[PDB]
């Protein structure tokens, strides 16, 4: 079924076979698939963690000083493959394609006065 | 099937029987094979390792001061056969034909202050 | 089969279902179809008539003073 309802704060990925390129989709709109494309999966809650909580995601997308996403001309999102990403809190966000979620909903590392954190 | 979808950061090799020469292919495009050619394999993730990690690959391609790849006129990539190659981190890359991957995803050799590394 | 060989002076039509729009294709190239598209038919000789001979075709395309096709 070409019809694809999306709950308002959710996302999906779709592979455009003609250009051979997947992309994430966002927003409330029931974005129907086009003829060249194929939906990867049913809609999923946007990756979110509470304030003073954190999450770690592989393959962060590149950003400028404006932190604007840098789309590639061929239709892939730009990705820092070897590099990782960490997040505390901000606006809810779609999972970008080619990223790999790892740590999530992790409580922020509390530290009592009498203890300490050895680091390398 | 002549159609050959390629995921955006992936590569494949194809042997052109007419000129009897293989070559790597790159990028998001669903590069269809030509009549003279035959695909070697299904698309594979580009060889990548994290920063402060390393990998070793046999048969490095030649490069100039610009580190530009030196394509041979006959269609083979240039190769340093006896010589090896090592890599720490940079942009994700296709595996060039005639190369042989060896070490990969290897953590960089950590060294604590009290120890030492005997070498030959 | 996505592969579509075209003889050098021939043409085919292809419907792009995503934009819901057909278009003609031209030239020697073995123009492979894209994922969104579907070939209408096998390649056909270009419509041609000899000098001091004539032909009539319905639904002419628009043209400018340059007689350029108006897509």
UniProtKB/Swiss-Prot annotation, chain C:
It comes from Rattus norvegicus. This is Major vault protein. MVP repeats lie at residues 1-52. MVP 3 mediates interaction with PTEN. MVP 4 mediates interaction with PARP4. Signal peptide: none annotated. It is found in: Cytoplasm; Nucleus. It comes from the Eukaryota. Required for normal vault structure. Vaults are multi-subunit structures that may act as scaffolds for proteins involved in signal transduction. Vaults may also play a role in nucleo-cytoplasmic transport. Down-regulates IFNG-mediated STAT1 signaling and subsequent activation of JAK. Down-regulates SRC activity and signaling through MAP kinases. Phosphorylated on Tyr residues after EGF stimulation. The vault ribonucleoprotein particle is a huge (400 A x 670 A) cage structure of 12.9 MDa. It consists of a dimer of half-vaults, with each half-vault comprising 39 identical major vault protein (MVP) chains, PARP4 and one or more vault RNAs (vRNAs). Interacts with TEP1. Interacts with PTEN and activated MAPK1. The phosphorylated protein interacts with the SH2 domains of PTPN11 and SRC. Interacts with APEX1. May interact with ZNF540. The chain holds residues 5 to 75 of 861 of the full protein.
